[PDB]
Coordinates of C-alpha atoms and ligand atoms in Angstrom, one line a residue:
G1 CA -0.2 0.3 -0.1
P2 CA 2.4 3.2 1.2
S3 CA 4.7 2.2 -1.7
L4 CA 2.3 2.1 -4.6
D5 CA 0.1 4.8 -3.0
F6 CA 3.7 7.3 -2.6
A7 CA 3.9 6.7 -6.4
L8 CA 0.6 7.9 -7.1
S9 CA 0.7 10.8 -5.4
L10 CA 4.1 12.1 -6.8
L11 CA 2.6 11.2 -10.6
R12 CA -0.1 13.8 -10.0
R13 CA 1.7 16.7 -8.7
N14 CA 5.4 16.1 -9.7
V15 CA 5.3 13.7 -12.9
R16 CA 4.6 15.3 -16.8
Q17 CA 4.5 14.4 -20.3
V18 CA 6.9 16.1 -22.4
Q19 CA 8.2 15.8 -25.8
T20 CA 11.4 17.1 -27.4
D21 CA 12.7 16.8 -31.2
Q22 CA 13.9 13.1 -29.5
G23 CA 10.7 12.1 -28.9
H24 CA 8.2 11.3 -25.7
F25 CA 9.5 11.2 -22.2
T26 CA 8.3 11.6 -18.8
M27 CA 9.5 14.5 -16.7
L28 CA 10.2 15.0 -12.8
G29 CA 9.3 18.2 -11.6
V30 CA 11.5 18.7 -8.5
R31 CA 11.0 22.0 -7.1
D32 CA 9.6 25.4 -8.6
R33 CA 10.6 25.7 -12.1
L34 CA 13.3 23.3 -11.9
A35 CA 12.9 19.8 -13.5
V36 CA 14.9 16.9 -14.9
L37 CA 15.1 14.5 -17.9
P38 CA 17.3 12.1 -19.5
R39 CA 20.2 13.5 -20.9
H40 CA 19.4 11.9 -24.2
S41 CA 16.1 13.7 -24.4
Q42 CA 18.1 16.9 -26.0
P43 CA 15.7 19.6 -24.7
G44 CA 16.1 22.7 -26.7
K45 CA 14.8 26.1 -26.2
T46 CA 11.4 25.0 -26.6
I47 CA 9.4 21.9 -24.9
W48 CA 6.1 20.3 -25.5
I49 CA 4.8 19.8 -21.7
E50 CA 1.5 18.6 -21.8
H51 CA 0.1 20.0 -25.0
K52 CA 1.9 23.5 -24.5
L53 CA 4.9 24.7 -26.0
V54 CA 7.3 25.9 -23.1
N55 CA 10.3 27.9 -23.1
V56 CA 13.1 26.6 -21.6
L57 CA 15.2 29.1 -19.4
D58 CA 18.6 26.9 -18.8
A59 CA 19.4 23.5 -19.5
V60 CA 22.5 21.9 -17.9
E61 CA 23.9 18.5 -18.2
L62 CA 24.6 17.5 -14.6
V63 CA 28.1 17.7 -13.4
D64 CA 29.6 16.6 -9.8
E65 CA 32.9 16.3 -7.9
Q66 CA 33.6 13.2 -9.7
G67 CA 33.5 14.6 -13.3
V68 CA 31.6 11.9 -14.8
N69 CA 28.5 11.4 -17.3
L70 CA 25.3 10.8 -15.2
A71 CA 22.8 10.6 -18.3
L72 CA 20.9 13.5 -16.8
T73 CA 20.0 17.0 -17.9
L74 CA 18.6 19.6 -15.5
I75 CA 16.1 22.2 -16.8
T76 CA 14.5 25.4 -15.5
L77 CA 11.1 26.2 -17.4
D78 CA 9.8 29.5 -18.1
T79 CA 6.3 28.5 -16.5
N80 CA 3.8 29.7 -13.9
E81 CA 3.6 26.3 -12.6
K82 CA 5.7 25.8 -9.4
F83 CA 6.3 22.2 -8.5
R84 CA 6.0 21.0 -4.9
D85 CA 9.5 20.6 -3.3
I86 CA 10.0 16.6 -3.2
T87 CA 13.5 17.2 -2.6
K88 CA 13.2 15.7 0.8
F89 CA 12.3 12.6 -0.8
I90 CA 15.5 12.3 -2.5
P91 CA 17.9 10.5 -0.5
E92 CA 21.4 12.2 0.1
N93 CA 23.6 9.0 -1.4
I94 CA 22.1 6.7 -4.2
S95 CA 19.8 4.1 -2.8
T96 CA 19.1 0.8 -4.1
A97 CA 15.7 -0.9 -3.4
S98 CA 13.6 -3.9 -2.6
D99 CA 10.3 -2.9 -3.9
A100 CA 10.5 -0.6 -6.7
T101 CA 7.8 1.4 -9.1
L102 CA 8.5 2.8 -12.0
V103 CA 6.4 5.7 -12.8
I104 CA 5.9 6.5 -16.7
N105 CA 3.7 9.3 -18.2
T106 CA 3.9 10.1 -21.6
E107 CA 1.3 10.9 -24.3
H108 CA 1.7 7.6 -25.8
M109 CA 2.1 5.9 -22.1
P110 CA 0.0 7.8 -19.9
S111 CA 0.2 7.6 -16.1
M112 CA 1.2 4.3 -15.8
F113 CA 3.1 2.0 -13.0
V114 CA 5.4 -0.6 -13.2
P115 CA 6.6 -2.5 -10.1
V116 CA 10.2 -3.5 -11.1
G117 CA 11.2 -5.5 -7.8
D118 CA 14.6 -5.1 -6.8
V119 CA 16.8 -2.1 -8.0
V120 CA 20.4 -3.1 -7.5
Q121 CA 23.7 -1.2 -7.6
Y122 CA 25.0 -1.5 -11.0
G123 CA 27.5 1.6 -11.6
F124 CA 29.3 2.0 -15.0
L125 CA 27.1 1.6 -17.8
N126 CA 27.7 1.8 -21.8
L127 CA 24.6 3.2 -23.0
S128 CA 24.5 2.7 -26.7
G129 CA 28.3 3.1 -26.6
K130 CA 28.0 6.4 -24.2
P131 CA 30.1 5.9 -21.0
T132 CA 27.5 6.3 -18.2
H133 CA 28.1 6.2 -14.2
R134 CA 26.0 5.9 -10.9
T135 CA 23.2 3.6 -12.6
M136 CA 21.4 1.1 -11.0
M137 CA 19.8 -2.2 -12.5
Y138 CA 16.2 -4.0 -12.5
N139 CA 15.5 -7.4 -14.0
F140 CA 12.3 -6.2 -15.7
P141 CA 11.7 -6.1 -19.9
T142 CA 11.5 -2.1 -19.7
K143 CA 10.7 -0.8 -23.2
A144 CA 11.4 2.1 -25.4
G145 CA 9.1 5.0 -24.4
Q146 CA 9.8 4.5 -20.7
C147 CA 12.8 7.0 -20.2
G148 CA 12.7 9.7 -18.0
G149 CA 10.3 7.0 -15.9
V150 CA 10.9 7.9 -12.2
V151 CA 11.7 5.1 -9.9
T152 CA 10.4 5.1 -6.5
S153 CA 10.3 3.2 -3.1
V154 CA 8.2 4.1 -0.5
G155 CA 8.9 7.7 0.7
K156 CA 12.1 7.8 -1.8
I157 CA 12.8 9.1 -5.1
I158 CA 15.8 6.7 -6.0
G159 CA 16.2 6.9 -10.2
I160 CA 15.1 8.0 -13.4
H161 CA 15.0 5.5 -16.1
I162 CA 17.3 5.9 -18.9
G163 CA 18.1 2.2 -20.9
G164 CA 17.7 -1.4 -21.3
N165 CA 18.7 -4.2 -23.1
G166 CA 15.1 -5.9 -23.3
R167 CA 15.6 -7.7 -20.3
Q168 CA 16.8 -5.4 -17.6
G169 CA 16.6 -1.8 -17.4
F170 CA 19.2 0.8 -16.0
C171 CA 18.3 4.1 -14.2
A172 CA 20.5 7.0 -13.3
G173 CA 20.5 7.3 -9.5
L174 CA 19.3 10.6 -7.7
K175 CA 20.9 12.3 -4.9
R176 CA 19.7 15.6 -3.2
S177 CA 22.8 17.3 -4.0
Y178 CA 22.0 17.4 -7.6
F179 CA 19.4 19.8 -7.0
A180 CA 21.2 22.2 -4.7
Ligands
AG7_1 C1 15.5 5.4 -29.2 C2 14.0 5.4 -28.1 O1 14.3 5.9 -27.2 C3 13.9 5.7 -26.1 O2 12.9 5.6 -26.1 C4 14.5 5.8 -24.5 C5 14.2 4.9 -23.5 C6 15.1 3.6 -23.9 C7 14.2 2.6 -23.0 C8 15.1 1.5 -23.1 C9 14.8 0.8 -24.5 C10 15.0 -0.8 -24.6 N1 14.6 -1.1 -23.3 C11 14.5 0.3 -22.5 O3 14.6 0.5 -21.3 N2 16.4 4.2 -23.9 C12 17.1 3.4 -24.9 O4 16.8 3.2 -25.8 C13 18.5 4.4 -24.9 C14 19.6 3.4 -25.5 C15 19.5 1.9 -24.8 O5 18.9 1.7 -23.7 C16 20.5 1.0 -25.1 N3 20.8 -0.3 -24.1 C17 22.1 -0.5 -23.5 O6 23.2 0.1 -24.3 C18 22.1 -1.5 -22.7 C19 23.6 -1.6 -22.1 C20 23.4 -2.7 -20.9 C21 24.4 -3.3 -20.4 O7 21.8 -2.5 -20.9 N4 21.4 -2.0 -21.9 C22 19.7 0.2 -26.5 C23 20.9 -1.1 -27.2 C24 18.4 -0.1 -26.4 C25 18.6 5.6 -25.5 C26 20.1 6.2 -25.6 C27 20.8 6.1 -26.8 C28 22.0 6.9 -26.7 C29 22.7 7.5 -25.6 F1 23.7 8.0 -25.7 C30 22.0 7.2 -24.6 C31 20.4 6.8 -24.4

């Protein structure tokens, strides 16, 4: 109950359908006008968000003290909307999970929840040939169209879906300091 329920609350207040020139993605709204996307979505100066065109004030590929690719892009949106601040639900350190749910919301895959099970430490990932770090893995057959999906455990927001090989899926881990 509490876990699936947490995922459903997040969907409504913080998860949005977007489209870039690279296709359809799920977006996590983090706080106020700040959101996060998979880097592969390559957001431009304008993005579609639930059937409206929105100006992008800033977009930054995420960097930290390790100086590694993390497969995420932070964006600040030129919008009236202010996301409820969910940073307190993001752990300070990358966190695995026993019973995670992947929350997907795109125009093609609207408002869906997928129990992916265990989310385990994985680390380095060559993602279609691009070196990527700080990933976690689930033994679930994730699909094209699910990138940006939000990986949650009860009371915690732990990852963003970025890739998979047909049998397993991979997320970029989330840490609170990314959003400081
Ligand atoms: C084009 C449509 O794009 C999307 O739908 C975005 C979401 C999908 C979801 C995948 C889609 C499939 N099962 C999934 O879960 N992600 C990708 O396709 C990514 C590539 C893979 O997942 C690669 N997997 C690995 O490398 C990989 C490595 C190991 C280990 O496991 N997977 C491809 C071989 C599938 C897209 C990408 C390409 C170049 C990059 F710089 C970085 C990312």
